[PDB]
Design an enzyme around this catalytic site. Structure first.
Site, PDB file in Angstrom:
ATOM      1  N   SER A  95       6.595  -2.406  -0.035  1.00 48.32           N
ATOM      2  CA  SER A  95       8.029  -2.167  -0.027  1.00 48.32           C
ATOM      3  C   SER A  95       8.316  -0.844  -0.730  1.00 48.32           C
ATOM      4  O   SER A  95       7.794  -0.587  -1.818  1.00 48.32           O
ATOM      5  CB  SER A  95       8.758  -3.317  -0.712  1.00 48.32           C
ATOM      6  OG  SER A  95       8.555  -4.530  -0.010  1.00 48.32           O
ATOM      7  N   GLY A  96       9.139  -0.002  -0.102  1.00 50.91           N
ATOM      8  CA  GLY A  96       9.309   1.360  -0.589  1.00 50.91           C
ATOM      9  C   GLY A  96       9.815   1.426  -2.017  1.00 50.91           C
ATOM     10  O   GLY A  96       9.247   2.127  -2.858  1.00 50.91           O
ATOM     11  N   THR A 139       8.750   0.322  -7.809  1.00 51.99           N
ATOM     12  CA  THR A 139       8.895   1.298  -8.881  1.00 51.99           C
ATOM     13  C   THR A 139       9.708   0.725 -10.032  1.00 51.99           C
ATOM     14  O   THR A 139       9.251   0.708 -11.183  1.00 51.99           O
ATOM     15  CB  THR A 139       9.552   2.566  -8.333  1.00 51.99           C
ATOM     16  OG1 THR A 139      10.947   2.326  -8.116  1.00 51.99           O
ATOM     17  CG2 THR A 139       8.912   2.971  -7.013  1.00 51.99           C
ATOM     18  N   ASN A 143       7.083   4.146   6.689  1.00 52.46           N
ATOM     19  CA  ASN A 143       7.361   4.467   5.293  1.00 52.46           C
ATOM     20  C   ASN A 143       7.506   5.979   5.178  1.00 52.46           C
ATOM     21  O   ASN A 143       7.449   6.705   6.176  1.00 52.46           O
ATOM     22  CB  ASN A 143       6.257   3.940   4.373  1.00 52.46           C
ATOM     23  CG  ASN A 143       6.722   3.775   2.943  1.00 52.46           C
ATOM     24  OD1 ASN A 143       7.586   4.513   2.470  1.00 52.46           O
ATOM     25  ND2 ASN A 143       6.146   2.806   2.242  1.00 52.46           N
ATOM     26  N   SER A 176       3.790   6.015   0.567  1.00 52.78           N
ATOM     27  CA  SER A 176       2.997   4.792   0.519  1.00 52.78           C
ATOM     28  C   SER A 176       1.739   5.021  -0.305  1.00 52.78           C
ATOM     29  O   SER A 176       0.973   5.950  -0.026  1.00 52.78           O
ATOM     30  CB  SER A 176       2.634   4.319   1.926  1.00 52.78           C
ATOM     31  OG  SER A 176       2.246   2.957   1.915  1.00 52.78           O
ATOM     32  N   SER A 177       1.520   4.167  -1.299  1.00 56.24           N
ATOM     33  CA  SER A 177       0.313   4.217  -2.123  1.00 56.24           C
ATOM     34  C   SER A 177      -0.858   3.704  -1.302  1.00 56.24           C
ATOM     35  O   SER A 177      -0.927   2.521  -0.968  1.00 56.24           O
ATOM     36  CB  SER A 177       0.493   3.385  -3.387  1.00 56.24           C
ATOM     37  OG  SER A 177       0.557   2.005  -3.075  1.00 56.24           O
ATOM     38  N   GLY A 229       0.364  -4.148   0.620  1.00 56.42           N
ATOM     39  CA  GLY A 229       0.501  -5.455   1.210  1.00 56.42           C
ATOM     40  C   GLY A 229      -0.080  -5.521   2.609  1.00 56.42           C
ATOM     41  O   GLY A 229      -0.764  -4.610   3.078  1.00 56.42           O
ATOM     42  N   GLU A 231      -0.241  -5.572   6.700  1.00 52.12           N
ATOM     43  CA  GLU A 231       0.298  -4.661   7.694  1.00 52.12           C
ATOM     44  C   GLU A 231       0.267  -5.322   9.059  1.00 52.12           C
ATOM     45  O   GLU A 231      -0.770  -5.838   9.486  1.00 52.12           O
ATOM     46  CB  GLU A 231      -0.491  -3.357   7.751  1.00 52.12           C
ATOM     47  CG  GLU A 231      -0.643  -2.659   6.424  1.00 52.12           C
ATOM     48  CD  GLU A 231      -1.662  -1.546   6.488  1.00 52.12           C
ATOM     49  OE1 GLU A 231      -2.640  -1.685   7.250  1.00 52.12           O
ATOM     50  OE2 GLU A 231      -1.482  -0.530   5.786  1.00 52.12           O
TER      51      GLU A 231
END
Ligand SMILES: Nc1ncnc2c1ncn2[C@@H]1O[C@H](COP(=O)(O)OP(=O)(O)O)[C@@H](O)[C@H]1O
Lengths: 519, 59, 370, 59
Positions: free
Chosen positions: A66-67, A71, A111, A114-115, A337, A339
């Site tokens: 989730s964007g 954070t 996104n 994305s990490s 997460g 995909e």
């Protein structure tokens, strides 16, 4: 905020709320989860109580693709931990975070930041429960992104950040233009996304390098490494006339790279075109087809980027470390997460397998806690382990006859094609597995080639191009070239009686390493 | 005795070194000239391969 | 658990672990026994030396190869060599590792029966397997189609493969190899004055062969050129000083591969047996065989052998085919490389001969099934 | 003093001799490698030229 059995489901409100500040709400001190309102700060307090009352490390696993919400939740919980066991460590964390943002993040089709790696923050506590310095740990990275990118996506920001033509000193030190369509390793998908500017990103990253202990060399050298990886992307070779051996045509990019990394052009070219092996107590050269040398080039770029990343990780962990001897800590595991896109590919298989392992892990945890609770009330009730057995059958991918196993098997198998691979897959699994099924390709969608039933539904994949994704034959000759380079950063990277390395193998072993880290 | 013996024989050793160095320079010239001639030869071969493949297509 | 690959060969043992790029241990397949008296009391003299320890002490030993022409003709010596390979070179325990042995095609069955019996009894390997050297060479070449010409120390053989199917009726096996060239060179050097008769001197001559010999593109005018000038003469220095110079011997030694009548054999050259093995194949696959001649083994390492081979086969084949001799630069270890690749495949882990199958079926299982 | 000084200068000059011999043999082996390959591909050029001529007759 919401409780879910053992999870903690929270939703991003998009609205400032005093539900966090001031301490008037952070009064959860001493309470359990069951009695207070369902706030994650109560969870953090429970983690404190548990780590103090059992002297056992604890773990925090949040879903992160989730964007936002990732954070702010990380920030608020780490602030809570700063408060309880009291230019702070949170300031310190968010200072150099642009490093990770620029190296391990790229525009994904669904996104824009994305990490592509796992962030496992270890926030340490005193033997009695006073916070100590905190060292972060990173893990497996989607490094196949270095070379290959799908349509409507792009690899890690730092390339485009640099390519923003902001500081011409860099673009001239790297002998590089500003057109992205001239360097293949980044120009496969889209060259730019309009949802973000790159100049401000370059400036944020420069500020991060400045606040870090980096010198002029610890910044220009990293720029040189990235530029050299980009100049790799247009190295061109031809068969030697009338015979089977790659021969160079044009060495401009070779000159650029040799100057950059502190290497020789002729030495680079020959060591790429003439690999050498330690046979017993002797040395003999190996011949090479062009594709094998291209594999070597890609593997070299990947390893360069990966070790540079890890070294920056260690540098940051050092820069945020000065503290007396400690004992205990809390694990903050950030992870991508699941995909499910309209066109699933190999990287998606990797990520889904990672998430599968993590979900089976959680299920094991909840299984044992429920079994404990049932033993507590003398409630006689036994059942097949909910934690492992229902998913142990969907990890065929790991059994050394399953999907990825057969994948490497074909990678070593000569003349192996995606059709041959599909044939072998169907031989080994079609009908003999219930989770393995044929995809329903109805005209109007892109074609899949097989379908697996995970816990997140039934997923379909398209096997086109996977040999190119998994092969990593590393060239030890150029490794020796690196281990001697004049560019001191290169030597610091590669300081410390080969042709078989697969992305699948390293991915799986790092996954198992993280699993042991958790369990 | 031993000193003058070593002197004479090792001056002869230096003489053989002059011989070997002369022949080494000669062999460097030989190698460079041969590789240049054979680069010319490989130009001839690539050209004649182009010629034969084009002309046999026409044929 | 990892597996062992133990390409034996008749002149060199190449061992290692399945999954590496090159063999971990390469030493001569030789056993030396002391020849002279022994007077120093307390020196601790051994009964026999194996490998390359027997090579540095060769001045006082009499060397024996336990493999003559791909066939193991001394089983105690072969057991010594295997024991050495496992315990002193690789430093493993054979009880914990499947072992992939290798064998030339078209040689007696008792060879493989004894191989597997020895392994399973006096080493207790969990499982084993006996491959064919040419198939592994093709694996290492990264192909599934081609006529591979393997030429080691004892035997030269062609095996034509197509799409992964062998043509066992076109396999042609020849019995001149490195060792017969070494003997022919020992015999030809006497006409200049040099006399090598001992086994240690045979090793010296083998090294001379590996350093100074090459295959002439055109034998006759090469002979005339060596007769006219003296630019073909090189010099070699024996391990006591005493340099020797050889002239046309340099290319007269390996020429025997193309005219085996030099050593009084009636067979044809390797080019001609390759062509015959091709012409024994179905007319549809031989166009693809002509373009995938894969050279393998040590005896194919002479300078100029690929060019001479291509010239000869081109002169034999029709004038429309494209003859391609594929000679990798590491072709001396192709069999071991292919063996490691094979033993690393996931789909191969059912092809082993488990200890239980042996206990049920006797040593005869090795060819009856596998 | 004279004797040992002589011996040491001599041994250094000789240890340069040995590397000169090694580089000499390397140069000559490279030159002969070259020339042999070059004459083999010269024969190849002869073959391809004969094919070029026969093909001209075909044209
Ligand atoms: N560089 C070389 N040039 C010519 N002949 C060689 C060379 N190296 C090895 N040989 C020959 O190859 C033989 C060993 O080859 P190898 O393939 O190891 O045999 P095997 O497969 O039976 O062990 C030796 O008898 C030697 O005469």
């Amino acid at each position: 905020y919401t409780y879910s059995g053992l999870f903690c489901v929270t939703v991003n409100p998009y609205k400032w709320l005093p539900v966090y500040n001031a301490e008037v709400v952070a009064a959860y001190r001493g309470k359990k989860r069951s009695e207070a309102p369902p706030h994650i700060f109560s969870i953090s307090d429970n983690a404190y109580q548990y780590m103090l009352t059992d002297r056992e490390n604890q773990s925090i696993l949040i879903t992160g693709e989730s964007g936002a919400g990732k954070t702010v939740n990380t920030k608020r919980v780490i602030q809570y931990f700063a408060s309880i066991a009291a230019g702070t460590l949170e300031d310190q964390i968010i200072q150099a975070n642009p490093a990770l943002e620029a190296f391990g993040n790229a525009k994904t089709v669904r996104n824009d930041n994305s990490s592509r790696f796992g962030k496992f923050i270890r926030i340490h506590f005193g033997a009695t429960g006073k916070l100590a310095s905190a060292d972060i740990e990173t893990y497996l990275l989607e490094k196949s992104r270095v070379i290959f990118q799908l349509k409507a996506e792009r690899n890690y920001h730092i390339f485009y950040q640099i390519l923003s033509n902001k500081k011409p000193e860099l673009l001239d030190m790297l002998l590089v233009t500003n057109n992205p369509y001239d360097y293949a390793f980044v120009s496969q998908g889209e060259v730019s996304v309009a949802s973000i500017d790159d100049s401000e990103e370059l400036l944020a990253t420069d500020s991060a390098f400045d606040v870090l202990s980096f010198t002029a060399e610890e910044k220009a050298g990293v720029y040189k490494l990235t530029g050299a990886i980009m100049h790799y992307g247009n190295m061109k070779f031809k068969q030697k006339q009338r015979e089977e051996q790659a021969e160079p045509d044009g060495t401009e990019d070779a000159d650029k790279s040799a100057y950059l990394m502190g290497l020789n052009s002729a030495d680079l070219l020959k060591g790429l075109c003439h690999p050498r092996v330690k046979v017993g107590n002797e040395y003999v050269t190996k011949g090479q087809s062009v594709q094998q040398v291209y594999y070597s080039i890609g593997a070299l770029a990947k390893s360069v980027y990966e070790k540079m990343f890890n070294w920056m990780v260690t540098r940051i962990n050092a820069t945020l470390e000065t503290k007396q001897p400690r004992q205990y800590f809390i694990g903050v595991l950030d992870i991508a997460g699941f995909e499910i896109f309209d066109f699933n590919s190999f990287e998606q298989l990797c990520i889904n397998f990672t998430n599968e392992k993590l979900q089976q892990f959680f299920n094991h945890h909840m299984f044992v806690l429920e079994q404990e609770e049932y033993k507590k009330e003398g409630i006689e009730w036994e059942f097949i382990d909910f934690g492992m057995d229902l998913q142990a059958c969907i990890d065929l991918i790991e059994k050394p006859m399953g999907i990825m196993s057969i994948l490497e098997e074909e990678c070593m198998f000569p003349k192996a094609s995606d059709m041959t691979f599909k044939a072998k897959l169907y031989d080994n699994h079609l009908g003999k597995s219930n989770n393995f099924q044929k995809p329903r390709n109805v005209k109007g969608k892109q074609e899949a080639h097989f379908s697996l039933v995970h816990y997140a539904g039934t997923v379909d994949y398209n096997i086109m191009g996977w040999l190119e994704k998994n092969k990593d034959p590393l060239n030890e000759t150029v490794v020796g070239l690196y281990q001697k380079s004049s560019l001191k950063l290169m030597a610091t990277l590669f300081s410390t009686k080969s042709s078989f390395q697969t992305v699948s193998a390293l991915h799986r072993e790092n996954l198992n390493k993280l699993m042991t880290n958790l369990k | 005795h031993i000193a003058e013996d070593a002197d004479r024989k090792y001056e002869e050793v230096a003489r053989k070194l002059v011989i070997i160095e002369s022949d080494l320079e000669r062999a460097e010239e030989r190698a460079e000239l041969s590789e240049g001639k054979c680069a010319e030869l490989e130009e001839e071969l690539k050209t004649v391969t182009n010629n034969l493949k084009s002309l046999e297509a026409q044929a | 658990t990892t597996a062992l690959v133990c390409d034996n060969g008749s002149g060199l043992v190449k061992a290692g672990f399945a999954g590496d790029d090159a063999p971990r241990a390469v030493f001569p397949s030789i056993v030396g026994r002391p020849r002279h008296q022994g007077v120093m009391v307390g020196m601790g003299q051994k009964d026999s030396y194996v490998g390359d320890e027997a090579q540095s002490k060769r001045g006082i030993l009499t060397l024996k190869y336990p493999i003559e022409h791909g066939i193991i003709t001394n089983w105690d010596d072969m057991e010594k060599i295997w024991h050495h390979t496992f315990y002193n070179e690789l430093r493993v325990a054979p009880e914990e590792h499947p072992t992939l042995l290798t064998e030339a095609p078209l040689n007696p069955k008792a060879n493989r029966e004894k191989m597997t019996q020895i392994m399973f009894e006096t080493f207790n390997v969990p499982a084993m397997y006996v491959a064919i050297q040419a198939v592994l060479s093709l694996y290492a070449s990264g192909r599934t189609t081609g006529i591979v010409l393997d030429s080691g120390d004892g035997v030269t053989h062609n095996v034509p493969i197509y799409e992964g199917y062998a043509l066992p009726h076109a396999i042609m096996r020849l019995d001149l190899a490195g060792r017969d060239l070494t003997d022919y060179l020992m015999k030809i050097l006497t006409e200049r004055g040099y006399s090598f008769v001992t086994t240690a001197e045979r090793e010296i001559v083998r090294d001379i062969k590996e350093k100074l010999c090459y295959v002439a593109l055109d034998f006759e005018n090469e002979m005339a050129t060596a007769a006219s000038s003296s630019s073909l003469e090189k010099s070699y220095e024996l391990p006591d000083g005493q340099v020797i110079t050889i002239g046309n011997e340099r290319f007269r030694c390996p020429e025997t591969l193309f005219q085996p009548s030099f050593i009084g054999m009636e067979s044809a050259g390797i080019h001609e047996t390759t062509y015959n093995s091709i012409m024994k194949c179905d007319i549809d696959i031989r166009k693809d065989l002509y373009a995938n001649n894969v050279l393998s083994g040590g005896t194919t390492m002479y300078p100029g052998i690929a060019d001479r081979m291509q010239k000869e086969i081109t002169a034999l084949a029709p004038s429309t085919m494209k003859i391609k001799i594929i000679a990798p630069p590491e072709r001396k270890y192709s069999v071991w490389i292919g063996g490691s690749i094979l033993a690393s495949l996931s789909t191969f882990q059912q092809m082993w001969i488990s200890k239980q199958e042996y206990d049920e079926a006797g040593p005869s299982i090795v060819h009856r099934k596998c």
